[PDB]
């Protein structure tokens, strides 16, 4: 019943807010820990023989991640007797805190759980998993940007983009594709993190807005497998005719908003020299674009054959409108001549 | 650092490698995870006993709680997977 569901989801919100507030480490590990328990059940609504093992995957990886994290905290304490976030004082510990967080974001090569888990749940729980869960671990990485061992960070940051690419060309059903999209953008967030966190948080905001746009659209059409999406051009042409655009904003074609992340990132890293890395990165982001395009071909640009049975469905308007949606489209697209406002994030 | 701590840490490393070698029915994994939990606990408590950093005497038990708590959750999922098969990770 909704009265319990809402308490769970609110305690997830709390279970992340807690990470964003507390300075003491123990309250952060508590933040993730409470977040987990409240995250699993919401994946289990409706409940499927499939969904169950989805949640098994998610829990199993999040649990081992949280374990390594707490271990590395304890080692940090052993070699500096502190609990405040700040710098860590022992590289053998620090790399593990980086690993634990690397699982929590789902960055490659730790990534393999994310495409699978997404498959196992409905687009509601899916969207929430790909947005809200991406806050907390980043919320702590921004706080430990000061001492990060950049080599280790850029390697996962790149490899997340290659794997976020190649594994994206291959799939049909959309949810797995959304998984590889996100797994690819996280490479771009976590890449620039050692150099300048404000660019990260900018990119984060764009990513969340974007994936809200998509998942609200998939909800609006209840499409899933690519073919299932293909029929929608005749029933409610607008929304396919809008998936095209939001997809291009994923692709970062430059007038569109989604270009704003990359094009600030390239700036920042370029101040650092490091000129080669963004070139490889930006080149691969293309590869990321391509399956957004193919998916666009299944949908709006071209009309796959309709099934007959569709006709009766034409009489019936969609209902239960999702208020927040139109703004999530528009912000995730047209906002490009409002980059400078990014400095609001200081 | 005194050798004992090194020994417990190593018990952690085994308590992880055991989780990841990961085989057959997964109930073993919830065990190995709990063992991992216990090693972190002990390694914490020895420290808080060491420096007489008294407030932190509260943490290990609190640590224990949530950690045990998630494991307490874990069995439930296993039930469900056990419910349709008679469990195996395979």
């Amino acid at each position: 019943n909704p009265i319990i569901y809402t308490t769970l989801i609110m305690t997830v919100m709390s279970g992340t807010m807690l990470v964003m507030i507390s300075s003491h480490w123990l309250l952060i590990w508590i933040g993730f820990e409470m977040n987990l328990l409240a995250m699993i059940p919401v994946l289990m609504k409706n409940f499927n023989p499939r969904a169950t093992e989805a949640a098994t995957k998610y829990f199993l990886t999040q649990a081992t991640a949280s374990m390594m994290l707490m271990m590395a905290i304890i080692i940090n304490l052993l070699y500096s007797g502190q609990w405040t976030i700040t710098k860590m004082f022992n590289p053998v510990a620090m790399t593990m805190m980086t690993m634990a967080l690397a699982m929590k974001l789902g960055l490659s090569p730790f990534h393999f759980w994310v495409p699978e888990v997404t498959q196992g749940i409905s687009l509601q729980a899916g969207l929430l998993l790909l947005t809200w869960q991406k806050l907390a671990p980043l919320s702590v990485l921004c706080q430990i940007s000061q001492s990060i061992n950049p080599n280790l960070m850029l390697t996962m940051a790149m490899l997340s983009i290659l794997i976020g690419g190649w594994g994206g060309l291959n799939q049909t059903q959309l949810r797995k594709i959304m998984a590889y999209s996100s797994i690819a953008h996280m490479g771009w967030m976590t890449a620039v993190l050692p150099y300048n966190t404000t660019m990260t948080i900018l990119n984060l905001l764009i990513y969340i807005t974007m994936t809200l746009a998509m998942f609200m659209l998939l909800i609006h059409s209840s499409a899933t497998t690519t073919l299932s999406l293909s029929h929608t051009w005749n029933k409610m042409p607008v929304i396919t005719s809008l998936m095209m655009v939001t997809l291009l904003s994923m692709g970062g074609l430059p007038p569109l908003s989604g270009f704003m992340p990359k094009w600030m990132i390239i700036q920042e890293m370029t101040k650092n020299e490091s000129i080669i890395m963004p070139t490889l990165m930006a080149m691969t982001a293309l590869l990321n674009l391509y399956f957004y395009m193919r998916l666009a071909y299944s949908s709006s640009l071209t009309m796959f054959p309709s099934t007959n049975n569709m006709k009766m469905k034409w009489q019936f308007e969609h209902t239960k409108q999702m208020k927040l949606l139109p703004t999530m489209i528009v912000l995730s697209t047209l906002v490009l001549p409002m980059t400078p406002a990014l400095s609001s994030l200081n | 650092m005194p050798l004992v701590y090194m020994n417990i840490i190593m018990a952690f490393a085994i308590a992880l490698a055991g989780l990841l070698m990961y085989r057959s029915h997964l109930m073993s994994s919830l065990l190995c995870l709990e063992g991992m939990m216990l090693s972190l606990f002990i390694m914490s408590t020895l420290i808080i006993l060491n420096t007489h950093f008294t407030l932190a005497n509260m943490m290990p038990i609190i640590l224990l709680v949530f950690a045990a708590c998630e494991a307490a959750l874990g069995l439930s999922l296993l039930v469900m997977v056990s419910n349709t098969y008679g469990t195996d990770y395979v």
Binding site: N90, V92 | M1, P2, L3, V4, Y5, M6, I9, N50
Partner: peptide, 15 residues
């Protein structure tokens, strides 16, 4: 100990 990071050795009591 050379592994991972140094283990100072000797008996436990010393600390």
């Amino acid at each position: 100990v050379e592994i991972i990071f140094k283990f100072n050795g000797l008996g436990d009591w010393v600390i």
